[PDB]
């Protein structure tokens, strides 16, 4: 399953954090710092599948942004990497060439999208067309 | 003459840098961040040489200042310049803190470019820099009276527990140490104790913690009055620069679906003059295990069907050694499915040192009314490191 | 429509110091709490804006200790946006007021009672994200009825299935196994693929512990998998991700099939084998697009199929084809594919039907290790090499590791030398090969060899070697380098002292040259090495009467007699008095044939 | 691809637009933000030309912050900054020569092969200026230019200009050029450092009293290389250098000490000046030790060599080198070493009164080193061995573990130095036999039991207690157990036949150690061959040992004294060791 989803910048400021397991604020901050430290050191030649405590992290870089999903050791890697890319594509389509400021100024809509695709630590919906239609219908209200 | 200057935070991330000679690359920065800031057993010294490069370091609060050179520089020059520059910065914006560095990056860069030219500390009186710099800094009840003892005594015990989860290839997935200091003092009167200790302690997921007694006073040094009998002075949890006493290497070979071979090698990563005692290694075995043939040249090994594990007991072991246990397991083919999910190998030990690297520097006991001092008091100090959850994935 | 918050982000970003940020946030918090605590009635839109601002303040990092009352009141509103804001705030920040928790439970019950799909979706998302004990005890009996009702919308069905998943994971004792299982199983035939995905996830988790109730889903799973893999480019266009039909659903279905024994029905097994063969055949085809995402999407399903094939382990042809495909993946640009293929072959290494197939890729594995830049790929390749090492290829694998040692990184050297020692001890057929391998290992990486290995090599050289001349010549050749170090010096001193007579015939290994080389090594090592070398010297005195005098002046030097160490002084004194006193025939009695190890 | 890379509504476009404004009020903030982003590692290359366009301004701050970014980029991306010299060259004719000096420094900070065309010409025109600071900066960047590998045909002219710059009325400038010449002389050709002794030395000694704090250091460092030729001239130089007790903590004082000790050659007692100079050299060294801990550490490292070369200077000043409780450990160890160095037969009664004190504190490292120092005292002074042994027995009786182990290890060495003098002590040691956990302490105890075997009637039982757990022990304790048991056999035969057979069986057969087996056979082949020769071979008289540990190579010591102030005297290694 999925433990948490993070969208971060290079400077370390967390742009989005979704948690699917119980944690405290200090523990959450420590985990965020550890994830940032682990992801930043690695270069582009390295793999995207990095062990982290007793889980693993599937991460992708988009310019100055880092998208991270923390999953169990026995879970599939390529499927969740493509889930990351699908999520990024839908974010780009919905925000009309999304940028970092778009995520900053519309955190609640991003939370709605993340709930639409990921729920209870699993993949909920995969189609871009249906997700976009639902989001447009909600925005029409 | 000064190769370059670096300013680091407590966590080990470089706050600022300024390199004056190209003969010093980022390898030097990494070497300082590893061998000095994150040293484990390195002997402390202000001037350290590594890879034919000399580093002079000065600590101010939780900030590190390093002057880097590759030549035979005048040693007193570097330290006098560091003191003068620290005094100048303190005069410009008061106390030296990481937040102040973040706010006055620009002024720091201007000062470094101004007072230090190519490594040559030109005339840099604080009064005369006002003309040359056009910027302005941004400033910002527990012990009864009437206690008597025939003799003065005290015991200190630093009790620590180390917890480790390690990957099969040797990557340290997680590690943290929980410790406490226990003081048992038979002292006559109302003594005052100054406790001095080194920098290994800063003042679910394990996070750094430090909690003192009610009698502790902070102003480095810790001043207190010991209550009679035994009491817990301070407790703490640390996560950085842990010293791991042991390293376990498992090698598991699955011969088809009927046999199995497990070879475990344990190594002792501490000094040869220290001795760990009561070592026990728990090696799991699959549920459908008909029997096991185990051979080891150190300690004794036995199989437990009720617990379904191999217990390997070593009475004691010295530092910088190695040991190996090899077991051949025969499996009855009941079900050709439900692969044996390997649980981690467990370790228990006791080491006569603090794995977190803590070391007590001094303890001065002064009595105002009576006449005795720390020379009269008899002092014992014991370190007891122990294993908590010590697991290596197999 | 919130200009104040929009300018709030800009104003807080414009702060030039931490004090400014703290002052601004404290002022805004004071304003918000004063407005809530005021007696003036304010509209619900202001409530929404201020709750959003508080949520932003919390996400900034600082704490919030109030505002729950307004957020909980927002749930009863009939405007969707206010309800979403309230539910988001409640999910992010949890309060311990029991009456407040009960009021939230009642409001969520009222929303569930409604027939609006969106409100039901919001309520289910709140339950799944919070997942507290109170929510479980309130809605465990209610959620499955919502899931199995035939008039519910598809989105509500997906959300309800995942909610039941979350409650089962967090509260397993509070969810009984009822009669709703048949509907859950039948959900796999729904035309909406998202419903199938949610049902597959829930069924996988439940059957991980209760196989009998859901064992009937295998036929539906294999039929849907066949329909997915045999579909054309104009079919299932809604769920087709970069020319790949339904990657995630197929992956989930294969994961579901992985937790069950092989199907009992022969028709089901035939269909499954057909599906796996079709997937592998489609994988061998050239890519249909240059985009990497198509490659990743296809490879995910491919690796899931391979894992299922390994798990079942009943089709030799499938295993051979999987081995061929995995071996093909080693010659690929992407590092991820190489890593995953190495893991998969290491899994295959423990299978009876594919030992030869995995062995065939030995040259490819060695080349990948030799040309590898990533450390993790190197480690997995080394583990694979150790895993597939057998009697026939033991020599090749050991030679490959020894050849790698010269240019190896220091971090991996300990693991490499340990594995090399284990393999050499295990597969030792010819004593000459074992002795040569151990001596080469020492000469290369003695800084990482233990103290048992070079006890064993000397024990074997003594007991039954018939290679004593071979043992001595290799050591004599190896000791001539300036980089010689501790373990090599020790074993070389012992071997030379014991068997210099066997190679003293050659003009390149005369006794004087041997002694000169050893004494050149002498003054650079620690005290146990020096004691061993002194025993070697007294051996030389008895073996070579021509060099005795030259040796004696070495002992008599002030560096030995007055040495600070006790052991060196005792050895020097004893040996000097042994050579000088008695006679030459007496000395040969103390230094006899060295009876062999027990 | 280009995901999140768009620059239509991003902060990069906003920053680029903000840099094109003509208002300095927002321009200063934009430049500060750019500098901060560059510090945080952001890529601001696309904004580089705009910052270049910011350089064409009249305000002082804006240019200063722009040159700060240029200096930042000079080390980061030299190629980008190389092409900007066309604006730097046209800045040496304006008023306010501090701008000219800043431009010269920044231009010298760039390392480009073709930059010489834009660098060689201005320098020859900047040494002749009204403002001496321009000449100072030029002298500084001369060394930076010399760092670049080039033929430098005009090096003769550069050195002539630097030499002519010394004879200048105005103080930190000349004590910057002397440092530049000292740096150049570090790579000294066969003909370098022309000895214009009279005028240059007179000018240096005249400007020495007027230079800045670092000026005295540079001048003294340069002068230390000089070799005098006249006894009267040497006396004059020493008399001129002695008043250096300046407010500078060490560097000035240490350099003055270096110069005086290198310039130390004269008649022994023909003139009452050698004694006066030796007396004057003590107060500055003594007052050096009151500085910050790092400077204390450097001063102690230098005082070690000073005491080594000539102990007469610090003969009676041992009271200063006592250890304070709050000092850092790296200063405590040096203080202990110096204390042991100065321990003469007169002050032992007080030095030993302190070392014992240091053995009753908490710091374990210092406790072990203090016990070792108690041991070192008894080998350096033969009239205090009884007192040192009494102190060690008291420290054994205090019943602390780490004190007892080190005390036994040290008593072994004291016994080896003075045989057949402390036989009665042995019994008191044995009672403290159950608290030996180190292998050094166990080895020392077994060795002591092996010796004096006739003075102990209980040695047999003591060694039988050791033999039971023969394995699971270090190799050195096994070796010393073999030697001790064999020695015991040769003194008490006909009653220990069980011991030797047992220990030789344990070493020969049970132990797989090669050299241990060799020694087992070597001993076995003596006892069974002839008991006459074996007694002479094993129990032969062992020659005594001198205290050779506390000594240094005279040539190395002379070189270090030649290099007192530098890092050569801190590592105590030759300068060629680190390069």
Swiss-Prot record, chain A:
Resulting phenotype, residue 15 to S: Reduces interaction with CD4 endocytosis signal motif
Recorded topology in the membrane: Peripheral membrane protein
Effect of residue 98 to S: Abolishes interaction with CD4 endocytosis signal motif
GO MF entries: clathrin adaptor activity
Keywords: Cell membrane, Coated pit, Endocytosis, Membrane, Phosphoprotein, Protein transport, Transport
Effect caused by changing residue 88 to D: Abolishes interaction with CD4 endocytosis signal motif
SUPFAM superfamilies reported in the protein's UniProt record: SNARE-like (SSF64356)
Family recorded in the similarity comment: Belongs to the adaptor complexes small subunit family.
Name under which the protein is recorded: AP-2 complex subunit sigma
Source species: Mus musculus
From Swiss-Prot, chain B:
Keywords: Cell membrane, Coated pit, Endocytosis, Lipid-binding, Membrane, Phosphoprotein, Protein transport, Transport
Keyword Cell membrane part of the UniProt annotation: yes
Compartments reported by the entry: Cell membrane; Membrane, Coated pit
Statement: the UniProt record of this protein carries the keyword Nucleus: no
Lineage: superkingdom: Eukaryota
List of residues that carry Phosphoserine: 45
Chain ranges of the MHD domain: 151-393
Tissue expr: Expressed in the brain (at protein level). Detected in spleen.
Gene Ontology MF annotations: disordered domain specific binding; lipid binding; low-density lipoprotein particle receptor binding; signal sequence binding; transmembrane transporter binding
One GO cellular component, as annotated: postsynapse
GO biological process, one term: protein-containing complex assembly
Chain sites annotated for binding a 1,2-diacyl-sn-glycero-3-phospho-(1D-myo-inositol-3,4,5-trisphosphate): 300, 304, 313
CDD domains linked to this entry: AP-2_Mu2_Cterm, AP2_Mu_N
Gene disruption phenotype: Embryonic lethal before day 3.5 postcoitus (E3.5).
Membrane topology annotation: Peripheral membrane protein
Major location category of this protein: membrane
Entries under InterPro entries matching the protein: Adaptor_comp_med_subunit, AP2_Mu_C_sf, AP2_Mu_N, AP_mu_sigma_su, Clathrin_mu, Clathrin_mu_CS, Longin-like_dom_sf, MHD
PANTHER family referenced in this protein's UniProt entry, alphabetically: AP COMPLEX SUBUNIT MU
Entry's family note: Belongs to the adaptor complexes medium subunit family.
Name assigned to this protein: AP-2 complex subunit mu
Native organism taxonomy: Eukaryota, Metazoa, Chordata, Craniata, Vertebrata
Curated annotation (Swiss-Prot), chain C:
Upper classification of the organism: Eukaryota, Metazoa, Chordata, Craniata, Vertebrata
Tissue localization of expression: Expressed in the brain (at protein level).
Protein name: AP-2 complex subunit alpha-2
Gene: Ap2a2
Species this chain originates from: Mus musculus
Residues holding a 1,2-diacyl-sn-glycero-3-phospho-(1D-myo-inositol-3,4,5-trisphosphate): 3-4, 35, 45, 49-53
Family: Belongs to the adaptor complexes large subunit family.
Top-level taxonomic group: Eukaryota
Keywords: Cell membrane, Coated pit, Endocytosis, Lipid-binding, Membrane, Protein transport, Transport
GO biological process: clathrin-dependent endocytosis; intracellular protein transport; postsynaptic neurotransmitter receptor internalization; regulation of hematopoietic stem cell differentiation; synaptic vesicle endocytosis; vesicle-mediated transport
Subcellular location: Cell membrane; Membrane, Coated pit
Curated annotation (Swiss-Prot), chain D:
Expression across tissues: Expressed in the brain (at protein level).
N6-acetyllysine: modified positions: 262
A GO term from the CC aspect: glutamatergic synapse
Underlying gene: Ap2b1
Name by which UniProt lists this protein: AP-2 complex subunit beta
Membrane topology: Peripheral membrane protein
Role played: Component of the adaptor protein complex 2 (AP-2). Adaptor protein complexes function in protein transport via transport vesicles in different membrane traffic pathways. Adaptor protein complexes are vesicle coat components and appear to be involved in cargo selection and vesicle formation. AP-2 is involved in clathrin-dependent endocytosis in which cargo proteins are incorporated into vesicles surrounded by clathrin (clathrin-coated vesicles, CCVs) which are destined for fusion with the early endosome.
UniProt-annotated location(s): Cell membrane; Membrane, Coated pit
Residue positions, PTM Phosphoserine: 1
Keyword Protein transport belongs to the record: yes
């Amino acid at each position: 399953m999925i433990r948490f989803i993070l969208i971060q910048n290079r400077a370390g400021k967390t742009r989005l954090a979704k948690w699917y397991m119980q944690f405290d604020d200090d523990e959450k901050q420590k985990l965020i710092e550890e994830v940032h430290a682990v992801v930043t050191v690695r270069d582009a030649k390295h793999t995207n599948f990095v062990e982290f405590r007793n889980f693993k992290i599937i991460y992708r870089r988009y310019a100055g942004l880092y998208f991270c999903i923390c999953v169990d050791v026995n879970d599939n890697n390529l499927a969740y990497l493509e889930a990351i890319h699908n999520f990024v594509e839908v974010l780009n389509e919905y925000f009309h060439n999304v940028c970092e400021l778009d995520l900053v100024f519309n955190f609640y809509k991003v939370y709605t999208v993340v709930d639409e695709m990921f729920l209870a630590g699993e993949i909920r919906e995969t189609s871009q067309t249906k997700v976009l239609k639902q989001l447009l219908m909600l925005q029409s209200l | 003459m000064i190769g370059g200057l670096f300013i680091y935070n407590h966590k080990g991330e470089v706050l600022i840098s300024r390199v004056y000679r190209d003969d010093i690359g980022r390898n030097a920065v990494d070497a300082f961040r590893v061998n000095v800031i994150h040293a484990r057993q390195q002997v402390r010294s202000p001037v350290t040489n590594i890879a034919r490069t000399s580093f002079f370091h000065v600590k101010r609060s939780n900030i590190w200042l390093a002057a880097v050179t590759k030549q035979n520089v005048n040693a007193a020059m570097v330290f006098e310049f560091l003191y003068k520059m620290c005094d100048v910065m303190a005069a410009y914006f008061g106390k030296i803190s990481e937040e102040n560095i973040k706010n006055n990056f620009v002024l720091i860069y201007e000062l470094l470019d101004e007072i230090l030219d190519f490594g040559y500390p030109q005339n840099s009186e604080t009064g005369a820099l006002k003309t040359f710099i056009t910027q302005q800094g941004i400033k910002s009840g527990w012990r009864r009276e009437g206690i008597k003892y025939r003799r003065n005594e005290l015991f200190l015990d630093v009790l620590e527990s180390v917890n480790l989860l390690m990957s099969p290839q040797g990557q340290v997935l997680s590690a943290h140490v929980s410790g406490r200091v226990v003081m048992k003092s038979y002292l006559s009167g109302m003594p005052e104790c100054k406790f001095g200790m080194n920098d290994k302690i800063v003042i679910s997921i394990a996070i750094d913690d430090c909690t003192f007694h009610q009698c502790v006073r902070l102003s480095r040094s810790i001043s207190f009055i010991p209550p009679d009998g035994e009491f817990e002075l301070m407790r703490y949890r640390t996560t950085k620069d842990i010293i791991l006493p042991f390293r376990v290497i498992p090698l598991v070979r699955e011969v088809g679906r009927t046999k199995l071979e497990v070879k475990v090698v344990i190594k002792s990563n501490f000094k040869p003059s220290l001795l760990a005692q009561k070592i026990e290694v728990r090696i799991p075995t699959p549920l459908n295990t008909s029997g096991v043939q185990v051979i080891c040249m150190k300690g004794k090994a036995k199989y437990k069907a009720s617990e379904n594990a191999i217990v390997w007991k070593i009475k004691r072991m010295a530092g910088m050694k190695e040991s190996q246990i090899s077991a051949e397991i025969e499996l009855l083919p009941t079900n050709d499915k439900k692969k044996w999910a390997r649980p981690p190998i467990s370790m228990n030990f006791e080491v006569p040192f603090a794995p977190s690297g803590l070391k007590v520097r001094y303890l001065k006991v002064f009595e105002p009314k009576l006449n005795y001092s720390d020379h009269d008091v008899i002092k014992w100090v014991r370190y007891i490191g122990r294993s908590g959850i010590y697991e290596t994935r197999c | 429509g919130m200009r104040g918050l929009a300018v709030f982000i800009s104003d807080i970003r414009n702060c030039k110091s931490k004090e400014a940020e703290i002052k601004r946030i404290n002022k805004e918090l004071a304003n918000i709490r004063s407005k809530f605590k005021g007696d003036k009635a304010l509209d619900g839109y202001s409530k929404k804006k201020y709750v959003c601002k508080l949520l932003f303040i919390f996400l900034l990092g600082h704490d919030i200790d109030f505002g729950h009352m307004e957020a909980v009141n927002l749930l009863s509103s009939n405007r969707y946006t206010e309800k979403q804001i309230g539910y988001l705030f409640i999910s992010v920040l949890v309060n311990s007021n029991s009456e407040l928790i009960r009021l939230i439970n009642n409001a969520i019950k009222n929303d569930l009672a409604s027939r609006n799909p969106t409100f039901m979706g919001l309520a289910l998302h709140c339950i799944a994200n919070v997942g507290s004990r109170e929510m479980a005890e309130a809605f465990a009996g209610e959620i499955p009825k919502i899931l199995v009702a035939g008039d519910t919308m598809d989105s509500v069905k997906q959300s309800a299935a995942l909610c039941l998943l979350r409650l089962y994971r967090t509260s397993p004792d509070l969810v009984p196994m009822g009669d709703w299982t048949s509907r859950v199983v039948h959900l796999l035939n729904d035309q909406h693929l998202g419903v199938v995905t949610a049902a597959t996830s829930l069924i996988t988790t439940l059957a991980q512990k209760n196989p009998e109730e859901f064992k009937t889903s295998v036929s539906l799973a294999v039929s849907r998998l066949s329909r997915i893999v045999t579909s054309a480019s104009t079919d299932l266009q809604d769920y087709t991700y970069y020319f790949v039909p339904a990657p995630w659903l197929s992956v989930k279905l294969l994961r579901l099939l992985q937790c069950y024994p092989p199907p009992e029905d022969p028709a089901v097994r035939g269909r499954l084998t057909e599906c796996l063969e079709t997937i592998l055949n489609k994988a061998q085809e050239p890519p249909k697009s240059k985009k990497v995402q198509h490659s990743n999407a296809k490879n995910a399903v491919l690796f899931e199929a391979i894992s299922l094939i390994i798990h079942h382990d009943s089709e030799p042809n499938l295993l051979v084809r999987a081995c061929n495909q995995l071996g093909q993946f080693l010659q690929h640009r992407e590092t991820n594919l190489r890593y995953l293929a190495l893991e998969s072959m290491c899994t295959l290494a423990s299978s009876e039907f594919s030992h030869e197939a995995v062995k065939t890729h030995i040259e490819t594995v060695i080349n990948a290790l030799k040309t590898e830049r990533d450390v993790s790929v190197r480690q997995r390749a080394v583990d694979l090499l150790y895993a597939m090492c057998d009697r026939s290829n033991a020599q090749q694998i050991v030679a490959e590791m020894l050849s790698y040692l010269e240019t190896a990184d220091y971090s991996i050297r300990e693991e490499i030398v340990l594995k090399v020692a284990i393999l050499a001890e295990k597969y030792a057929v010819d004593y000459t090969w074992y002795v040569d391998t151990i001596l080469n290992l020492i000469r290369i990486a003695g800084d990482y060899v233990s103290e048992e290995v070079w006890y064993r090599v000397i024990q074997i050289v003594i007991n039954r070697d018939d290679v004593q001349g071979y043992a001595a010549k290799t050591v004599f050749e190896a000791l001539q380098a300036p980089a010689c170090h501790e373990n090599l010096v020790k074993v070389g001193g012992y071997i030379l002292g014991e068997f210099g007579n066997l190679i003293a015939g050659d003009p390149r290994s005369s006794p004087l040259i041997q002694f000169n080389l050893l004494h050149s090594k002498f003054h650079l090592c620690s005290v146990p090495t020096r004691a061993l070398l002194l025993s070697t010297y007294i051996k030389f005195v008895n073996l070579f009467p021509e060099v005795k005098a030259t040796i004696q002046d070495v002992l008599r030097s002030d560096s030995q007699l007055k040495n600070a160490d006790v052991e060196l002084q005792q050895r020097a004194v004893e040996y000097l008095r042994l050579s000088t006193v008695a006679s030459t025939d007496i000395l040969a009695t103390v230094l006899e044939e060295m009876p062999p190890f027990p | 691809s280009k995901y999140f890379t768009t620059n239509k509504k991003g902060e990069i476009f906003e920053l680029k637009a903000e840099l094109n404004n003509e208002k300095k009020e927002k321009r200063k903030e934009a430049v500060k933000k750019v500098i901060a982003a560059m510090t945080v590692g952001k890529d601001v290359s696309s904004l580089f030309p705009d910052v270049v366009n910011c350089m064409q301004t009249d305000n002082l701050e804006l240019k200063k912050l722009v040159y700060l970014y240029l200096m930042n980029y000079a080390k980061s991306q030299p190629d980008m900054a190389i092409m900007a010299v066309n604006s730097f060259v046209k800045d040496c004719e304006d008023p306010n020569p501090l701008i000219r000096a800043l431009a010269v420094r920044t231009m010298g900070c760039i390392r480009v092969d073709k930059i010489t065309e834009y660098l060689c010409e201005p320098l020859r025109k900047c040494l002749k200026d009204e403002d001496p600071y321009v000449r100072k900066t030029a002298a500084v960047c001369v060394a930076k230019l010399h760092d670049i590998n080039a033929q430098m045909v005009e090096d003769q002219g550069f050195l002539d200009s630097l030499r002519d710059l010394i004879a200048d009325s105005n103080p930190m400038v000349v004590a910057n050029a002397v440092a530049a010449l000292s740096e150049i002389s570090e790579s000294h050709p066969n003909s370098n450092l022309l000895d214009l002794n009279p005028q240059n030395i007179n000018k240096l000694l005249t400007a020495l009293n007027e230079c800045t704090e670092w000026g005295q250091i540079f001048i003294l460092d340069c002068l230390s290389n000089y070799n005098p030729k006249d006894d009267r001239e040497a006396q004059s130089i020493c008399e001129r250098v002695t008043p250096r007790l300046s407010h500078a903590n060490s560097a000035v004082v240490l350099s003055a000490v270096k110069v005086l000790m290198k310039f130390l050659e004269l008649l022994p007692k023909d003139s009452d000046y050698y004694n006066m100079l030796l007396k004057k050299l003590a107060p500055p060294l003594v007052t050096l030790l009151s500085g910050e801990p790092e400077v204390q550490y450097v001063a102690l490292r230098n005082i070690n060599l000073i005491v080594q070369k000539r102990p007469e200077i610090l003969k009676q000043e041992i009271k200063v080198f006592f250890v304070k409780y709050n000092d850092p450990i790296y200063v405590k160890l040096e203080k202990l070493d110096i204390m042991i160095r100065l321990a003469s037969q007169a002050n032992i009664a007080q030095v030993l009164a302190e070392l014992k004190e240091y053995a009753t504190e908490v710091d374990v490292d210092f406790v072990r080193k203090a016990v070792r120092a108690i041991g070192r005292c008894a080998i350096k002074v033969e009239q205090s061995a009884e007192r040192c042994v009494s102190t060690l027995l008291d420290l054994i009786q205090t019943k602390v573990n780490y004190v007892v182990q080190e005390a036994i290890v040290v008593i072994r060495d004291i016994f080896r130095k003075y045989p057949n003098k402390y036989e009665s002590i042995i019994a008191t040691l044995c009672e403290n036999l159950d608290s030996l956990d180190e292998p050094d302490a166990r080895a020392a105890m077994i060795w002591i039991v092996g010796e004096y075997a006739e003075r102990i009637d209980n040695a047999d039982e003591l060694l039988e207690s050791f033999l039971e757990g023969f394995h699971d022990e270090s190799t050195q304790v096994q070796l010393t157990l073999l030697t001790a048991i064999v020695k015991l056999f040769l003194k008490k035969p006909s009653e220990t036949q069980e011991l030797v057979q047992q220990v030789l069986s344990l070493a020969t057969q049970d132990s797989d150690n090669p050299d241990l087996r060799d020694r087992g056979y070597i001993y076995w082949r003596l006892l069974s061959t002839d008991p006459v020769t074996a007694k002479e071979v094993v129990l032969s008289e062992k020659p005594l040992i001198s205290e050779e540990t506390d000594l240094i190579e005279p040539t190395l010591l002379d070189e270090l004294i030649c290099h007192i102030g530098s890092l050569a005297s801190v590592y105590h290694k030759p300068p060629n060791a680190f390069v």
